[PDB]
Amino acid sequence: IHFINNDLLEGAADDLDQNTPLLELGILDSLSMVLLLAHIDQQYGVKIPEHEINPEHFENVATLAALINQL
Amino acid sequence: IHFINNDLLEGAADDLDQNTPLLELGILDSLSMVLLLAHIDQQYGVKIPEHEINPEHFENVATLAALINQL
Amino acid sequence: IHFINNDLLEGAADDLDQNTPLLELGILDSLSMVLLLAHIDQQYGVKIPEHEINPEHFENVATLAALINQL
Amino acid sequence: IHFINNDLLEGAADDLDQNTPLLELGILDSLSMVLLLAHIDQQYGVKIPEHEINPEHFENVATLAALINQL
Amino acid sequence: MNFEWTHEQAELFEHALRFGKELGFPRDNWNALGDFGYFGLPIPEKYAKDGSGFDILTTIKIIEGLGQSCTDTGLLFAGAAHTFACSMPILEHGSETLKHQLLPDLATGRKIAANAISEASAGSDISNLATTAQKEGDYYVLNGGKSYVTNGSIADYYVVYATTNKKHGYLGQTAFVVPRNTPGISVGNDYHKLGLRSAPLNQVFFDNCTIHKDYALGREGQGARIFAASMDWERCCLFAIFVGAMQRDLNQCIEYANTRMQGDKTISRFQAVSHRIADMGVRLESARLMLYYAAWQKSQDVDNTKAVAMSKLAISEAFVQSGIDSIRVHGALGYLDEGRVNNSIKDALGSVLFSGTSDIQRELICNRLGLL
Amino acid sequence: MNFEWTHEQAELFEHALRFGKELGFPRDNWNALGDFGYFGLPIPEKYAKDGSGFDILTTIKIIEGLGQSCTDTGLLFAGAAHTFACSMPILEHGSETLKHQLLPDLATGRKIAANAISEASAGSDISNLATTAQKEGDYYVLNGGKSYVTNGSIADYYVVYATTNKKHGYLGQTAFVVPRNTPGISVGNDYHKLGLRSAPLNQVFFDNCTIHKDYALGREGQGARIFAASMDWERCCLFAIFVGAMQRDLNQCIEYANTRMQGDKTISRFQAVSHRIADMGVRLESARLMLYYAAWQKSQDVDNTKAVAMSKLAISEAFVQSGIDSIRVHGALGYLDEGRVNNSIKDALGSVLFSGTSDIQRELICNRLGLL
Amino acid sequence: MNFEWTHEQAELFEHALRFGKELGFPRDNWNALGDFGYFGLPIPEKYAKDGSGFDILTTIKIIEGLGQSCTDTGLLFAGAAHTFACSMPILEHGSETLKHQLLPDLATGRKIAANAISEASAGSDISNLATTAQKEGDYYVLNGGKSYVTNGSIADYYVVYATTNKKHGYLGQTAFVVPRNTPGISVGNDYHKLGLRSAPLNQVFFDNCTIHKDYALGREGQGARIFAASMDWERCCLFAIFVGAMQRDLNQCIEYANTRMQGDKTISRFQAVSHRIADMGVRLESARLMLYYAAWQKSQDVDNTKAVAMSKLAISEAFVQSGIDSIRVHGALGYLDEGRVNNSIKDALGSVLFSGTSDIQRELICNRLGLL
Amino acid sequence: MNFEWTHEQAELFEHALRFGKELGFPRDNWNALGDFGYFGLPIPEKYAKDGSGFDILTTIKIIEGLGQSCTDTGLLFAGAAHTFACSMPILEHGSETLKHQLLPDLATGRKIAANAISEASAGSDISNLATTAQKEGDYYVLNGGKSYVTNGSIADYYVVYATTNKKHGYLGQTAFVVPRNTPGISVGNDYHKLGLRSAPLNQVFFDNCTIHKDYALGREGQGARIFAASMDWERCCLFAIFVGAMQRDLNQCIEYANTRMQGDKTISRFQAVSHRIADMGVRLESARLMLYYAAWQKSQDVDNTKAVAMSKLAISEAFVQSGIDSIRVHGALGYLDEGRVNNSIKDALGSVLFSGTSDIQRELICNRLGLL
Numbered sequence A, B, C, D: 001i002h003f004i005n006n007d008l009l010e011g012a013a014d015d016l017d018q019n020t021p022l023l024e025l026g027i028l029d030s031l032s033m034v035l036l037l038a039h040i041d042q043q044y045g046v047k048i049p050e051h052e053i054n055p056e057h058f059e060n061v062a063t064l065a066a067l068i069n070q071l
Numbered sequence E, F, G, H: 001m002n003f004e005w006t007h008e009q010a011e012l013f014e015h016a017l018r019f020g021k022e023l024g025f026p027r028d029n030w031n032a033l034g035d036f037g038y039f040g041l042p043i044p045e046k047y048a049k050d051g052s053g054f055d056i057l058t059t060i061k062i063i064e065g066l067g068q069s070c071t072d073t074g075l076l077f078a079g080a081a082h083t084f085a086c087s088m089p090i091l092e093h094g095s096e097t098l099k100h101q102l103l104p105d106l107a108t109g110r111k112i113a114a115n116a117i118s119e120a121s122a123g124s125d126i127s128n129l130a131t132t133a134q135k136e137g138d139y140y141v142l143n144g145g146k147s148y149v150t151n152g153s154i155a156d157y158y159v160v161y162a163t164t165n166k167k168h169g170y171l172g173q174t175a176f177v178v179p180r181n182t183p184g185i186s187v188g189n190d191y192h193k194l195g196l197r198s199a200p201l202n203q204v205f206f207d208n209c210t211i212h213k214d215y216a217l218g219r220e221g222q223g224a225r226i227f228a229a230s231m232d233w234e235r236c237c238l239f240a241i242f243v244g245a246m247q248r249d250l251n252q253c254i255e256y257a258n259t260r261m262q263g264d265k266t267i268s269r270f271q272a273v274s275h276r277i278a279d280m281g282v283r284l285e286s287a288r289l290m291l292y293y294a295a296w297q298k299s300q301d302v303d304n305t306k307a308v309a310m311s312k313l314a315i316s317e318a319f320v321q322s323g324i325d326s327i328r329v330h331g332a333l334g335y336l337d338e339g340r341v342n343n344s345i346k347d348a349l350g351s352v353l354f355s356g357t358s359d360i361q362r363e364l365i366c367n368r369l370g371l372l
């Protein structure tokens, strides 16, 4: 979450929380996804399988956190 | 006002109104000022004197509209 | 003559003399003519009139020397 | 010999013959040697060994012809 | 680390070089390329009887050879668009039934596929596609216009990228194979355009086209990532054409500069000409190595996107410079159509736009370098 | 030192800008340019009834205006070739009788002139012309082929440069005005070429053409220097066309980048696009100032060859970059013919070849800098 | 429209060219430039006894002459920073009392001024200045660090730009002249940097500096626009130095290429060398004309910002290319310090950063072209 | 065809990367590089006890690693000049006795060698060397000045190229190893020069130096071809340094552009910055692949001169662009010496001169392309 604000959104979106719809608001896209996946790999040791990149897991920080736990 | 939204802010700031603080929020800056002054000249025939570029007149759309009327 | 050898021909043509046919052998051409005319102006104070640029005067160093004297 | 005149010297040196000193007059140098060696390979099937590149063989066309025969 | 081709790979390359001389839409030449095996190079035998199932390096080397010997670049481009943007996502993401149904005729070129994503308002940004697909039982209804479809007029199938769920943004699109005979497809006449005349370019409209769900490629929502995977294939392999085309440009300039004389010397003797040619050779060695590296890396299952984007950019930019420099070297003769030189610049200027513009390639490179 | 145009010069420029909208070979448009006064701008009233006798600066400013508003660049180019390479040497070196005979119809465009020097083996090097002229009493007999004659097919007169004395080298050529009706002239069909479609380009052969000596321009042997003087006019004034064409390219890119959106912003918001446009503006201001400087200097009776060669080079090189960058900015739409953008690159690539290639301009610059 | 200098302007230029030979911090040379009149060129006699009150064109022409003849570019740069970034805003926005107090010694160079806006976090973006000024009765208290102050160590006054009202954003800054003797100023040692050794560059800290309100330039809030006006002066006039420096580079390359031989010809005979020099001449004519145009336009009371930004960009970019090409032409000798060539590249690389980087100049150009 | 390094090669590369941190003339660092094995990488164990006898690819990969991690580029350059221009021709052309006598201490760096061919009048053209060697019994007497000798002041041996027979032209020179203690050698002080401060550069004079004939490398007359062979080694392997240095530049720019903010975004968000970095990445991938290709090809016993000249040119040109772009990205901080960025441009400008200028590399490329 600090990550998305700093690396992905930089300036503002200081309203960002575990419920912000990441896909719907365009926060996660083809470019930001690459950076997020690298961060997840670095910070948590988790390499998200292709099957798992979907709207259920990437809906928001909470659901994404849930996927990383499962993995 | 349509102008500031379309030409200066393009995407979003659909909350913009006659009270939005233009200077305080960084909407009017050295570059956007040039475009605004050209628009004012084209759309209203008014060339804002140098003395008149100040925080009183450019506070918001209402105050700016007030200056253009005076002129 | 030292000039044509050094500035215009640089390397070799050490056989060059007051009889070498400058036009016929391609020594004087559109580019070398400019440099020669500038040299003549600098070294002798003479600006060759347009009428005087012809095959009679530029046949060789002797004939060219003859033109510069006349002028 | 036609080769040296056309490919290596292009314009003029129409005095060139089997006695022209190729090394001494600067006709054969690091660049022209590459082209000559390629021609020799193409035209005669001969790849001149390194030991054989020397002033005895490359003195002139006659001596070079002699080397290519030997090989 | 080596730059050695196997005897077999060399043989295939020489076969491609020799094939060039054996050559409306040039359908007969398309079919000749089909018989040569151009559309089947990367298709496994499992799915097409004479599919070569070559690895990426062998495939790009043959394509390079064809780009060198076949002067109809536009035709090669049409063929590569069909193979890499259409046959490969089908191979990678189609059901087993779809693959057996479609690949045999794609592989021979008997049927032709076109890739369709760009719209009136979607070009460099394909995040928001106006083309929609609505689920209705076992079928999808597709609605929208696609604006620059290579092979549009000749296509037997369209690989079409459509929004299935606006709210899922990036993961809200889906890929579909849309047969040409689907009621509701209309296609405009081939555009007149600067180059690549043999590769048709067309507007295609989908007016409530109903297709069975078995025509979907991958799962609902996977559209953006399948498109990225197809561009990884296209940006990598299609551009091998232009590396071959540049070898041809270079060969032509060397021959010409050694033959053409001005004032009793070959023009090769002026460094303005010869150093210009030297830089064509430099940029070509560079672009070719970048291609080989991208193709090798794509075979390694690492993220090869940076290498592919660098290769696409370097090849297409070198190709524009090659087209301009070939004209310069040839003088008025290069400006004349009979000079057989001026197709390089016309075609090259396409190559810095399609498959993502040069600006987009740099966006991708910057992203893979980790730039925020 | 000032950059102010007189009220009159401004008026003429605005008149040129407005004239653009009023617009095989486009003969009707040629005649419309004739009526506007395009072919008479630098001709004194003494020689043509509505000849404007404008100075060089006024003349180039009007031409720039036409290059901006007339989209048929090729047509302007044909017109400028006729005026600067043909009408001007006639004006400067023709007998008084030749001038009164020829200039009135040249000045209105009723008769068209073509410049003919390049041959099968003479392009950048024109030191050795295979075309010969033999004196026979009061006549010359002309024999040879000229290979790239602009206006070749439509010409009423050829200004032809021929060897009169091999042994006099550089001072062994002579200029002649050769009427089209001279027995022994044959002209090939217009070449198909990359751009400038409205400007015919042709092979012209002179098979023992007999002409009266009063058709000679200047004296026997003056051919090389008269040709240099005509290129001083052409390299200076003809290229004003492309400075106008570049203002148009720039205006189109600014409009497009402010209108076209990708992902909810105008493409003007990407520095890859906007900084590209900024550099088109920079290169254009530069090329325009270089033109103005060359035209001013040409009016001063100093050697203005360096300034003219720099201007020709800078304009023609900027024009190639402008053509490429306009396509880049416009994306696929710029690649399509209907995008009305891709004529700039096609035409620009001509402009770095004709009137001496860029390499020759640098030869001339180097010479005027005093480089040995 | 003409490019003619008056007899007087020519005389002044020749005077500047001759002055070059008459030449820690080189204080004696600074004072010699003072006596020549360098710091007084644009100051009216009304404010300084030997102030020349020259127009912009005359002023830039003299500066160009000095940039050509004075090899200490860094020294000229220090002098121009003082004059254009400091003396001019004082002249334009200081009270009459401040002007009579400060300008006489600024004009002779007896006192030296430094411009101070950049901070640890403010460089290309100066919208948010961490340096604050708080009103307290008739005084302001200034607090903050300025990070790259040219003339920092030698300055008798700082023109300092500070935030007076955070909420007024762009119109919330104010300009102040801060005397060096104000308690609370500390200055770091001169930085070691790539070039321009004679122009000190320093960190300057303002620790609760109290100054009288009569030291304010203009009104509270006018800081951003006064800074823009001072950059209009600096970007226009200071860069005249480097146009002169480039004439010197070019003259040196022509001399060297005509003198230095490799294998029995002058290196001028290789087009890799001579065409390189031709392009230095082209880029220099271009940059000089752009300067003249910007200076002329600045005298016309129109928005001249586009022309000034184009000139700054073209001059500084040409100067980097000139520095690199001079080394190339001179070979190892250019790499050696005794070659007296390698200061151009070291100095030039400064010129694409200070007064706004090249990227910022393109931002300004894009804005003046009307790009959104 | 693959781009895979063996586990061993990877290990050696990582060892080189780690070694960088462990670091008048920096003799202690020179000896540390000696202990690491830098001077022995390509020397067979047969001739030096800890000589690694690595192949060319392994050797260049380690050098690249050192160029990346060791910030003293000048030091690496000194070391590579010694190894590739001196140790390799000794290895390839020295008698067995000379090799056993000299290589053990060359390989550890205990003795240092310098390459000496350039003279007052011989630089790019080395066809006519003023330095002579006269046979006298079993000895040669050497006479002449060598003008730019890297390692001149520190050299224990000079590899000196001298004319033995004027009439044999190209095949009239001979190579000699000249010990420093030979009476008649004098060396000037190290030149002050733009970059590469740790690599001494000196004038060396040979005043009737007598040496035994066993110090000749190869046969009388083989000098030109031995020099070409040593430049094949140097142009190939020495330039691996700068590919590493460019990886460092790129890493620094990415870090900085992701950290430095202007107006509340990282500067990475401006495409003027990020697309600039993307092109540094492109040019670096390209230069690295060209190096790998040249090194591989050099191991194949084909004429690898074209590939080596292309690599030298591409690396050294990319390195100049990298140095300039790093400054641009870093702003004023890159201009300051403490920014630790500005050594790249200073060093890079050396790399386009030594080992043959860029113009000479293009001469060689043109020749290998078959241009007349």
Ligand SMILES: Cc1cc2nc3c(=O)[nH]c(=O)nc-3n(C[C@H](O)[C@H](O)[C@H](O)COP(=O)(O)OP(=O)(O)OC[C@H]3O[C@@H](n4cnc5c(N)ncnc54)[C@H](O)[C@@H]3O)c2cc1C
Binding pocket: E081, E114, E115, E116, E117, E118, E122, E123, E124, E125, E148, E149, E150, E151, E196, E201, E350, E353, E354, E355, E356, E357, E358, E359, E360, E363, F260, F261, F262, F267, F270, F271, F272, F273, F328, F329, F330, F331, F332, F333, F335, H271
């Ligand atoms: C010959 C040809 C064949 C084609 N074939 C096909 C096909 O088969 N199928 C298909 O779907 N499409 C096809 N296209 C469309 C092609 O992929 C697009 O033209 C390309 O993606 C650019 O889109 P655009 O034309 O809308 O330009 P825009 O996206 O409008 O771009 C205009 C300019 O803005 C710049 N720009 C836009 N976004 C950014 C950004 N984020 N950063 C920096 N700059 C930016 C661009 O680089 C360009 O300079 C083809 C195009 C051509 C020319």
Ligand SMILES: Cc1cc2nc3c(=O)[nH]c(=O)nc-3n(C[C@H](O)[C@H](O)[C@H](O)COP(=O)(O)OP(=O)(O)OC[C@H]3O[C@@H](n4cnc5c(N)ncnc54)[C@H](O)[C@@H]3O)c2cc1C
Binding pocket: E260, E261, E262, E267, E270, E271, E272, E273, E328, E329, E330, E331, E332, E333, E335, F081, F114, F115, F116, F117, F118, F122, F123, F124, F125, F148, F149, F150, F151, F196, F201, F350, F353, F354, F355, F356, F357, F358, F359, F360, F363, G271
């Ligand atoms: C659209 C168009 C219209 C034309 N109209 C006319 C016309 O009306 N009348 C007419 O007579 N001609 C005309 N020409 C011919 C034109 O002037 C020539 O094409 C031009 O002079 C170059 O000659 P070339 O084509 O023979 O090329 P070449 O001279 O063969 O040159 C080929 C290449 O070699 C280079 N080269 C040649 N010499 C040198 C040198 N000394 N130094 C460095 N490089 C060199 C050239 O720059 C070029 O890159 C026209 C050409 C075009 C394209």
Ligand SMILES: Cc1cc2nc3c(=O)[nH]c(=O)nc-3n(C[C@H](O)[C@H](O)[C@H](O)COP(=O)(O)OP(=O)(O)OC[C@H]3O[C@@H](n4cnc5c(N)ncnc54)[C@H](O)[C@@H]3O)c2cc1C
Binding pocket: F271, G081, G114, G115, G116, G117, G118, G122, G123, G124, G125, G148, G149, G150, G151, G196, G201, G350, G353, G354, G355, G356, G357, G358, G359, G360, G363, H260, H261, H262, H267, H270, H271, H272, H273, H328, H329, H330, H331, H332, H333, H335
């Ligand atoms: C020799 C020298 C003398 C100087 N003298 C003075 C002086 O007297 N007084 C003074 O106040 N300052 C001075 N400066 C500071 C100078 O004005 C700045 O260095 C310059 O404004 C750039 O700021 P910066 O160094 O912080 O770089 P940054 O602003 O951090 O920029 C780093 C990079 O990001 C790019 N970038 C930043 N913003 C944008 C954008 N909007 N669009 C595209 N790219 C962007 C830049 O172009 C640059 O490539 C001097 C600098 C030098 C080198």
Ligand SMILES: Cc1cc2nc3c(=O)[nH]c(=O)nc-3n(C[C@H](O)[C@H](O)[C@H](O)COP(=O)(O)OP(=O)(O)OC[C@H]3O[C@@H](n4cnc5c(N)ncnc54)[C@H](O)[C@@H]3O)c2cc1C
Binding pocket: E271, G260, G261, G262, G267, G270, G271, G272, G273, G328, G329, G330, G331, G332, G333, G335, H081, H114, H115, H116, H117, H118, H122, H123, H124, H125, H148, H149, H150, H151, H196, H201, H350, H353, H354, H355, H356, H357, H358, H359, H360, H363
């Ligand atoms: C840092 C450094 C270290 C060096 N170390 C050594 C060393 O250890 N041993 C040693 O012997 N030498 C050394 N040199 C010398 C170096 O090899 C030469 O500087 C180089 O060969 C160029 O020679 P030059 O300086 O005389 O330039 P010149 O040969 O005078 O060249 C000047 C210009 O003319 C151009 N030119 C010359 N000939 C041609 C041509 N045929 N075609 C096109 N253009 C041409 C050049 O490219 C250059 O632009 C070193 C130089 C430097 C800068």
Ligand SMILES: *P(=O)(O)OCC(C)(C)[C@@H](O)C(=O)NCCC(=O)NCCSC(=O)c1ccc[nH]1
Binding pocket: A030, A031, E081, E082, E085, E115, E117, E118, E123, E124, E125, E126, E127, E150, E224, E225, E228, E231, E234, E353, E354, E355, E356, E357, E360, E363, E364
């Ligand atoms: P991400 O999934 O990796 O997406 C990357 C970015 C965000 C850069 C995305 O916007 C993108 O890839 N834009 C470029 C679009 C593109 O490549 N369009 C090509 C359409 S198909 C093409 O032009 C063609 C020709 C022949 C066959 N297909």
Ligand SMILES: *P(=O)(O)OCC(C)(C)[C@@H](O)C(=O)NCCC(=O)NCCSC(=O)c1ccc[nH]1
Binding pocket: C030, C031, F081, F082, F085, F115, F117, F118, F123, F124, F125, F126, F127, F150, F224, F225, F228, F231, F234, F353, F354, F355, F356, F357, F360, F363, F364
């Ligand atoms: P000198 O008299 O000043 O000659 C200069 C040099 C020696 C460079 C000479 O070779 C030259 O000028 N070469 C270039 C030839 C040239 O400009 N050819 C143009 C032919 S006419 C042209 O192309 C055209 C188009 C329309 C009308 N004319």
